[model samples]
Target: ERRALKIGVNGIPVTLEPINAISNVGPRIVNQIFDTLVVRDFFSNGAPGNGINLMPSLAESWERIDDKSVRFKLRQKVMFHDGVEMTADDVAYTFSSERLWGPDAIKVIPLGGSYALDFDEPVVEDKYTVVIRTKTPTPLTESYMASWMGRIVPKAYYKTLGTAAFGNKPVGTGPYKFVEFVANDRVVIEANDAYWGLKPTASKITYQLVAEPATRVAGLISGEYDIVTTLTPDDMALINSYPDLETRGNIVENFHMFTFNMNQPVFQSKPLRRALALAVNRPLIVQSLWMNKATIPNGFNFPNYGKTFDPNRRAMEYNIEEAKRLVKESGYDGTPITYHTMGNYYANAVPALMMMIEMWKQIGVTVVPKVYAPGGAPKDQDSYMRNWSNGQWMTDAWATMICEFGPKGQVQKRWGWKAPAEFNDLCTKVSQIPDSKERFDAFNRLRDIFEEEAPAVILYQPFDVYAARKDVHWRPIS
Candidate 1:
């Protein structure tokens, strides 16, 4: 009886350690081993669809009141893979330990270090309930509870091994137990019978790093792998030809955009930003390169994610006359705009960017594009993260809110423009509003203002594609 499940993933690094598990490398490796308390739908829009479905990897339920305090009730029956029964102390330690040592570990705990609190003091009333008091009323606190940052770990296990050893043998109360890692090649996981929730269908989940997209498709076609987690646009025709392979392309959280370094001299003028925006031919880029697979975001935000997205938001449609007018108005007669980029990373990124460069060249803007080689290891990809902005600006559809955007807590480091004092105030309001409708309205106002200003140009949402055997009856949550 053949029982092994072989999964082909995009190239991730070796060293599947937990302390440094922020990159695509670590998540691709450890998702089979450690489970988050709340798992997102593959295509969630930040509302009811994004509600928590998976539960109790450590916490059973959570509640917020008066917009300031959050209460979490831990599941008592849960145990770590090491057979240690989970207690309130272990839950407290998971949050405190991340605060003390985990790079962004404070995110694992409640309040996320946004407001200062004493991690050393555990406000546990009993083995099941833990209360978190925040400085203000924050609404998304519960939503944050379900993110990867909130996963619980056993205290005693990690304390004995310390950070160095804990990296190699990270322990968590998830569906599968950590087993062994072969650097740059594959990661292996074995099922944990002591899993607190519905056990996964697979017995042994093995992730093999295959960097080349063609090789990934070939592996799936030849029956060497059961599932291929990513598929390129070019692979669609071939997969559609196959009867056993089922391909799914749905919107994920990945937002593709071009960011302007507002601090730089070249992009300082709003007219120049407007000119560059109008020059790019988005429809051509999407149809030619993406094969109509992704959604063109209506500005900085994606569609149907509450009031954040403005369907009527103006885009830089191809208009040579308008683009040239703005270029002249911005005091740039014929200067080259440096389009800095690291190529061949995301799906269709290189091709789409090339198209953008060509379009910009038509409007008296010389496009000088530079591409960098991929440089991220399994454990420290987040730290090694760098991107090309024509200026020294970072751009993403969702960077401002997430830690991935820039240095944590240093609000001034963003593009020399004062941090959105008003938006920050809105987030502060949302955090404590507690009323879902009111909170969403506050967030919507923030989105409306950001989209109107166009700090970054929204290109499109990258599609998260996956192909599995049709016989398995798998429907991805997207």
Candidate 2:
């Protein structure tokens, strides 16, 4: 019998385009269809939350050539979805300035990953070996290498299709090959028999969009869906009651926050931004919405980040009086603010978001919540409330501070908040520093600026959960 895994998810990515991947659903699907040059060693046993190994995937072995270059030895005989063999040329074309990270490149979704990948054209030495020549000394080479941005695409196939057509129908060297994608409805992928690494056990995997958590739980109970995504902490008890069903939950490396468009005149005032931040009682909301499954992180630094984390640097605090004072200080306008968000995309996202809006109302502010349909989030909004994550993809402060808030992050991309040149330099500096007190100081200074500016309201780290039949071996990716 052919093993087929049916997944019921809150949402499915509108596009399978690797470079444009940023939404919550993207990683849940994209990682299966695409492979990166380097990947975190999830196989070997290590300290909980510590995977120090940078293992090879598309590339067989890579070596640091110098401060500014790293040469990758490509794995030969690797077959793309189109049956063409993957070579060094494919890797170069994938990261080319024309496609990914240049002034006039394809408008990629958050290539803040390119902070370490600041590069010119890759120097293709031969069919198997290519040198990644960066403009700067890339100390965070391994971090960006394992990033989703490194998911290589076939040069010939992509060139023929161009950006739009290629994303709609992508070809990759990963375990799954794209069969069909019905946007916001279903995405179907069949197993690649010619995959170079671990074989996909399931012959076909189908991800169906069922946004209602109750509907998802019902599907799991009825054995209609083998697995379910975006389960809330509240749904755990009922799912585990069924002898044949079980749920998996964890505090993933992500935070759900309110991203302010600094370009908006309402948020341009530092006092207003700070007031909105101070109004959020993060710990209380976390306890109520997450049921204490997630912890409020210490200023965007997680314990898993090793020496880079600093617990003493406090996160946002609730101060009604201060918030009230700031609103009045900003030459208070009574304009109603529209906060754009997704419906139940994250566990308890809507409930928590509503609670936050009510908190702002305590200071006489009218903050309206606008929940978008699946794949309907728009850029033209007063603010964005969404999830920003690293997924153990980057084990540095760079993930949140630089990638999401720094120069090329949500501040610039989604929010139209232009970062200062000094802040830009600090982000680059902190990302490359080795484990030291100097690194700690650099992050602290960056935190100081972010906290003072209060460009966004970091609500809480999320405890993402999912449900599945106990017989199914698949689980949510960490």
Root-mean-square deviation of every model: 6.0, 2.4
Each prediction's whole-model lDDT (CA): 0.58, 0.77
Error of 2 at 39 (Å): 1.7
Highest-TM-score candidate: 2
Candidate 2 TM-score over all chains jointly: 0.92
TM-score of each: 0.75, 0.92
The clash numbers for all candidates, in the given order, read 6, 0
Off by over 4 Å in 2: 43-45, 106-116, 378-392, 418-422, 428-436, 476-478
Please, what are the lDDT tens digits per residue for candidate 2 over residues 275-345?
A: 88888888778778778888777676777666677867775577999999999988768888877767777
- True-vs-predicted CA distance for residue 320, candidate 1, Å: 4.6
Reference-based lDDT, residue 330, model 2: 89
